[PDB]
Amino acid sequence: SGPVPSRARVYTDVNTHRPREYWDYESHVVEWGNQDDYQLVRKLGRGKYSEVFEAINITNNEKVVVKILKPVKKKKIKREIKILENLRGGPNIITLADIVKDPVSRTPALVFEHVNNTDFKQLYQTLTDYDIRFYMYEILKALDYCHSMGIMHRDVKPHNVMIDHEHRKLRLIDWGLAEFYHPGQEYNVRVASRYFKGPELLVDYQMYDYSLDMWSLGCMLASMIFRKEPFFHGHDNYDQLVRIAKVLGTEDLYDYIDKYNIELDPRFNDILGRHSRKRWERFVHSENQHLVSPEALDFLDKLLRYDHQSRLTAREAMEHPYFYTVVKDQ
Numbered sequence: 001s002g003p004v005p006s007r008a009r010v011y012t013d014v015n016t017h018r019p020r021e022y023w024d025y026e027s028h029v030v031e032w033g034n035q036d037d038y039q040l041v042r043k044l045g046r047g048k049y050s051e052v053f054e055a056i057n058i059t060n061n062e063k064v065v066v067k068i069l070k071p072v073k074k075k076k077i078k079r080e081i082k083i084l085e086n087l088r089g090g091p092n093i094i095t096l097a098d099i100v101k102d103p104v105s106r107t108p109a110l111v112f113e114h115v116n117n118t119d120f121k122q123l124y125q126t127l128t129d130y131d132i133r134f135y136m137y138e139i140l141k142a143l144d145y146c147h148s149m150g151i152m153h154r155d156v157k158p159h160n161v162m163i164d165h166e167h168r169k170l171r172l173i174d175w176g177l178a179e180f181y182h183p184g185q186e187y188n189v190r191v192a193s194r195y196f197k198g199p200e201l202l203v204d205y206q207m208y209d210y211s212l213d214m215w216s217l218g219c220m221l222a223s224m225i226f227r228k229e230p231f232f233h234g235h236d237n238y239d240q241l242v243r244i245a246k247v248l249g250t251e252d253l254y255d256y257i258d259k260y261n262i263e264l265d266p267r268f269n270d271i272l273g274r275h276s277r278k279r280w281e282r283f284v285h286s287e288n289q290h291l292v293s294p295e296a297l298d299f300l301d302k303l304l305r306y307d308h309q310s311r312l313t314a315r316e317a318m319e320h321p322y323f324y325t326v327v328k329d330q
């Protein structure tokens with residue numbers, strides 16, 4: 001009658017063996033700080049959910065990044081804070097230094113460790129083949145850690161990867177979309193950016209898991225190695241599935257729909273058509289060849305799969321020979 005259920009292949013039950021307070025974020029009490037510890041120095045950007053500022057901690061002149069939240073429901077803020085606290089200190093995770101509240105306007109504001117420069121405008125531009133491997137391996141460290149801590153990031157894309165190319169350091173940021181994985185739980189599919197949503201989000205399969213972040217990572221890698229950003233350039237959510245299908249083929253699409261007994265929105269019944277699975281060589285040209293290799297295409301093929309169950313996990317991804325040179329170098 002309904003969709004066939006699903007469980008993560010790894011880290012399935014790590015949140016069950018935790019004390020309830022670790023993932024029951026609705027019950028978390030926020031420990032506020034004094035916002036008068038801090039002065040804003042200048043603005044750095046503004047995303048969909050917050051404005052971002054360079055700022056200074058006046059007691060100990062420490063330099064800091066301040067994210068002033070546009071108003072969201074109290075429970076999503078408790079979620080983000082709890083996740084950031086759980087992950088603090090893990091590899092390549094942004095560190096949450098404080099959390100403050102404007103006395104007048106009552107707006108919450110997270111305070112983070114300084115890092116500078118973003119993946120955009122330096123992504124498909126200045127990085128060598130070895131850079132891409134190195135930085136991808138650093139992202140995998142973050143994803144494997146957070147998954148092993150029971151947490152889905154759900155918004156992996158270049159805008160949320162802060163790289164500081166001088167010091168070869170990387171932080172995975174904006175955890176406001178992240179969730180705890182619980183076996184059997186049905187999640188909201190209206191997450192992540194259009195170009196990075198996995199097939200499970202596009203077909204509205206709610207019992208997804210960590211492997212969602214591995215579809216996004218595969219999207220990021222495809223755009224970097226082919227120098228085509230975004231790789232899947234959908235007009236909207238329904239067309240986004242069409243763009244994937246024109247690359248991955250429809251056969252595996254309808255195979256995935258049947259294995260999980262997914263009801264396909266009748267909207268799709270006309271735009272998907274029939275498409276062969278294309279070979280990756282179709283995307284290689286003179287301008288991107290120096291970043292493409294058999295290793296990279298093989299690795300990519302194993303991230304971009306319809307069946308979320310069959311994607312490389314993060315730990316498996318780090319064992320792929322695309323990263324042999326990186327691993328030996330540390």
Ligand SMILES: NC(=O)Cc1c[nH]c2ccc(Cl)cc12
Binds near residue numbers: 066068100
């Ligand atoms: N002393 C202040 O209240 C300055 C200020 C205005 N708006 C903010 C938002 C966050 C943080 Cl940490 C500081 C500020």
Ligand SMILES: NC(=O)Cc1c[nH]c2ccc(Cl)cc12
Binds near residue numbers: 112173
């Ligand atoms: N949220 C952003 O993408 C804006 C931004 C620019 N530069 C940063 C550095 C650190 C952090 Cl947390 C955020 C930013």
